[PDB]
Amino acid sequence: SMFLPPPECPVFEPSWEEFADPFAFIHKIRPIAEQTGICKVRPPPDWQPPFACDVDKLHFTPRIQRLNELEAQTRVKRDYTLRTFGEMADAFKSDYFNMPVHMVPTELVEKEFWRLVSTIEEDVTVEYGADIASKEFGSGFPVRDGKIKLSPEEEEYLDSGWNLNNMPVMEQSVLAHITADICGMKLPWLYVGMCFSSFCWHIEDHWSYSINYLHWGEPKTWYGVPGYAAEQLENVMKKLAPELFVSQPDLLHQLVTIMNPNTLMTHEVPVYRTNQCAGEFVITFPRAYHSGFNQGFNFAEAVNFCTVDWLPLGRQCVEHYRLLHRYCVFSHDEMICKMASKADVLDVVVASTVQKDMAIMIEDEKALRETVRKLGVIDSERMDFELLPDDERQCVKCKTTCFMSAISCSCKPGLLVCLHHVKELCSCPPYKYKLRYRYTLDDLYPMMNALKLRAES
């Protein structure tokens, strides 16, 4: 009546054999889970990573959060220890309900969350932690270091595929051999939650997958939307909260919001829910919108990742970003070429998939270069784009991160446009322009061939 809970998302309980390889398992469940956008994974009963921490030495800077539906919030950026945060969080919840924190039904907290964010009268504010691992607050999974000797139990999980520190650097991921500095995206994030602290509706940068583990504490409640419904969700959001779609100045100025899933379901957006309990994984699929809130004091860890399934979507995403003039986190083409340059050490299924994306890349690049030559750009010079700081190689028009090529003019020292935007650089005639290119077509075809050879083994 007030709140109707979405249907439950799929839950998987893999055997140890199924569970052992995360990439194989994810690939297996994909036909099911990509229809719901999120799914939950319960590890085999004895997969039990050790959690040990001194709650008095772990400290972090809390973020503060107002809970109002449709109100704009920014995506990223006082001091608590984990103990004092926990004490604040438990006291907040038990005072809010006049009940012991674990006797509050999850259904009631959910019901109450959607009441309070919708009511103008209520101004509930809460606090939470969000950051990558640091020396003041490290991963919840075991990691190697010289100062501290690990237990056999800890040593056991150092190399698990489901140890999220490993996830980026494994063989079936395509961020395995990448060099670029993208700390925000390839490293796990740590999240300290409290009752009602929430994550707004969003998809991951570059439409990547995410995997999310709840180390300990009260559950995390999720809502998820399949990738095929992303634009329908965005249309609903645009109608109700147009303020969120204004042009973003920087990459750290993305606007996001809380919105009732019933509102989406009313507008024919399929939504699924789940309560993630301690020791369970949630996986989000490419372009799957998700949001949620915490039932109480808890500690989660999450990481982005990209499988071979994702590669063509990664290309479509960058294209989508260009149309929106949205900043990129990294160059997709640069990643592809980096992998091609390491074709000999690539996993062979990876090589095969990269080869297919590269073929599309080369065909598109060939066409774009013919077009800019017909616009009268004649002069050219090789340019090592990967050496430029990222904010020094964005298209002044569409903000895309250049790598394959760009146009420059000595009239505008340091400015670049991608080849879709030759006419947006300056008023000089095109013969004053230079095509800056990373590779000639004669460079590119042998790189692609190396991938083919590797994939033919």
Ligand X SMILES: N#CCSc1nc(-c2ccccc2)cc(=O)[nH]1
Evaluate whether 123 touches 183 at the Cβ level (below 8 Å). Answer: no
State the nearest-atom distance from the C-beta of 408 to Mn ion, in Å: 8
Nearer residue to Mn ion within complex by CB, 165 or 210: 210
Nearer residue to Zn ion within complex by CB, 33 or 398: 398
Tokens of 295: 């039932």
State the nearest-atom distance from the C-beta of 191 to Zn ion, in Å: 35
Residue 204 is assigned to a ligand binding site: yes
Among 236, 418, 447, 451, the residue binding Zn ion under the rule CB under 5 A is 418
Burial of 319 (0-12, 13-18, 19+ CB in 10 A): middle
85 contributes a contact to ligand X by CB under 6 A: no
**Segment contacting Cl ion by CB under 5 A, of 115-123, 330-338, 372-380, 413-421:** 115-123
* Residue with the CB atom nearest Zn ion in the bound state: 411
Binding mask 197-226 for Mn ion (x = CB under 5 A): -------------x----------------
Helical residues (DSSP H) of 290-381, grouped into ranges: 311-324, 332-340, 348-374
Residue 210 is assigned to a ligand binding site: yes
State the nearest-atom distance from the C-beta of 83 to Cl ion, in Å: 29
| Contact residues for 26 (Cβ-Cβ < 8 A; gap 6+) | 209, 283, 307
> Comparing C-alpha atoms, which of 259, 257, 265, 267 is closest to residue 236?
267
Residues 340, 346, 401, 224, CA torsion sign: positive
> Comparing C-alpha atoms, which of 70, 109, 125, 65 is closest to residue 263?
70
| Contact residues for 403 (Cβ-Cβ < 8 A; gap 6+) | 331, 333, 334, 337, 385, 386, 393, 438
| Contact residues for 371 (Cβ-Cβ < 8 A; gap 6+) | 419
Binding mask 359-398 for Mn ion (x = CB under 5 A): ----------------------------------------
190 contributes a contact to ligand X by CB under 6 A: no
Residue 47 carries which side chain, given as an amino acid letter?
A: W
Nearer residue to ligand X within complex by CB, 212 or 408: 212
Residue 128 is assigned to a ligand binding site: yes
Q: Write out the binding residues for ligand X, residues 58-77 only, by CB under 6 A.
A: 75
Among 23, 80, 137, 191, the residue binding ligand X under the rule CB under 6 A is 191
| Contact residues for 367 (Cβ-Cβ < 8 A; gap 6+) | none
With both helix axes pointing from N to C terminus, report the angle between 348-374 and 441-456 in degrees, rounded to the nearest 10: 160
**Segment contacting ligand X by CB under 6 A, of 85-93, 98-106, 190-198, 230-238:** 190-198
68 contributes a contact to Cl ion by CB under 5 A: yes
Nearer residue to Cl ion within complex by CB, 109 or 409: 109
Q: Which does 68 bind (CB under 5 to 8 A by kind): Mn ion, Zn ion, Cl ion, none?
A: Cl ion
Q: Which does 378 bind (CB under 5 to 8 A by kind): ligand X, Mn ion, Zn ion, none?
A: none
| Contact residues for 365 (Cβ-Cβ < 8 A; gap 6+) | 404, 405, 441, 444
With both helix axes pointing from N to C terminus, report the angle between 348-374 and 311-324 in degrees, rounded to the nearest 10: 30
Q: Write out the binding residues for Zn ion, residues 339-398 only, by CB under 5 A.
A: 395, 397-398
> Comparing C-alpha atoms, which of 217, 183, 181, 225 is closest to residue 201?
225
Per-residue CA distances from 95 to 31, 105, 345 (Å) = 44, 15, 57
Among 68, 172, 197, 248, the residue binding ligand X under the rule CB under 6 A is 197
Residue length of the chain: 457
> Comparing C-alpha atoms, which of 272, 296, 289 is closest to residue 88?
296
Bridging pattern class, strands 379-382 and 433-437 = parallel
Nearer residue to ligand X within complex by CB, 130 or 407: 130
160 contributes a contact to Cl ion by CB under 5 A: no
325 contributes a contact to Zn ion by CB under 5 A: no
Order of all β-strands in the sheet with 298-305: 11-12, 38-41, 281-284, 209-217, 298-305, 189-193, 125-132, 63-66
State the nearest-atom distance from the C-beta of 196 to Cl ion, in Å: 10
Nearer residue to Cl ion within complex by CB, 122 or 153: 122
Residue 253 is assigned to a ligand binding site: no
Residue 202 is assigned to a ligand binding site: yes
Q: Write out the binding residues for ligand X, residues 259-318 only, by CB under 6 A.
A: 294, 300, 302
**Segment contacting Zn ion by CB under 5 A, of 122-130, 168-176, 410-418, 441-449:** 410-418
With both helix axes pointing from N to C terminus, report the angle between 348-374 and 332-340 in degrees, rounded to the nearest 10: 120
Site for ligand X, rule CB under 6 A: 75, 128, 130, 191, 193, 197, 199, 212, 294, 300, 302
Annotated binding site for Fe cation: 202, 204, 290
Site for Zn ion, rule CB under 5 A: 395, 397-398, 409, 411, 418, 420-421, 426, 428
Annotated binding site: 128, 202, 204, 210, 212, 220, 290
Site for Cl ion, rule CB under 5 A: 68, 122
Site for Mn ion, rule CB under 5 A: 210
